[PDB]
């Protein structure tokens, strides 16, 4: 039970895992609000 370690998945993380997870979660999110302009320099 508690004798073994159960966090061995992170041994198999590449250099793009964070960004890939972000890009796949991009479809699960509500639309962002808007400030009314393209940018503060606009």
């Amino acid at each position: 039970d508690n004798s073994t370690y159960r966090n061995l998945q992170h041994h198999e993380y590449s250099t793009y895992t964070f960004l890939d997870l972000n890009v796949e979660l991009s479809k699960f999110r509500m639309p962002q609000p808007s400030s009314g302009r393209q940018s503060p320099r606009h």
């Binding site: 400030s35 009314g36 302009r37 503060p40 320099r41």
Partner: protein, 87 residues
């Protein structure tokens, strides 16, 4: 940014000719009143002095910077253009 030199009124004479000294190249002035400057507490006192001494005078109203509203909050504005790009 100091403002301590803009408290009193100054009366000064007009600029006249200055030339280069033929020997040693110094600057020469033929008029005595060139270095003269007087300090007055208010405009009325200076005007009275000028009239009493019989000098034609030009008087200019004092210029004071207008009050300006400054807000720290404006730098991090949500929608207005006062947002700072960096600090």
């Amino acid at each position: 940014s100091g403002v301590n030199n803009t408290k009193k009124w100054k009366m000064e004479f007009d600029t006249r000719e200055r030339w280069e000294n033929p020997l040693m190249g110094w600057s020469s002035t033929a008029d005595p009143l060139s270095n003269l400057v007087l300090t007055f507490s208010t405009k009325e006192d200076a005007v009275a002095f000028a009239e009493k001494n019989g000098w034609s005078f030009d008087v200019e109203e004092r210029k004071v910077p207008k009050p300006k509203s400054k807000s720290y909050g404006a730098n991090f504005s949500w929608n207005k253009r006062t947002r700072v790009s960096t600090k």
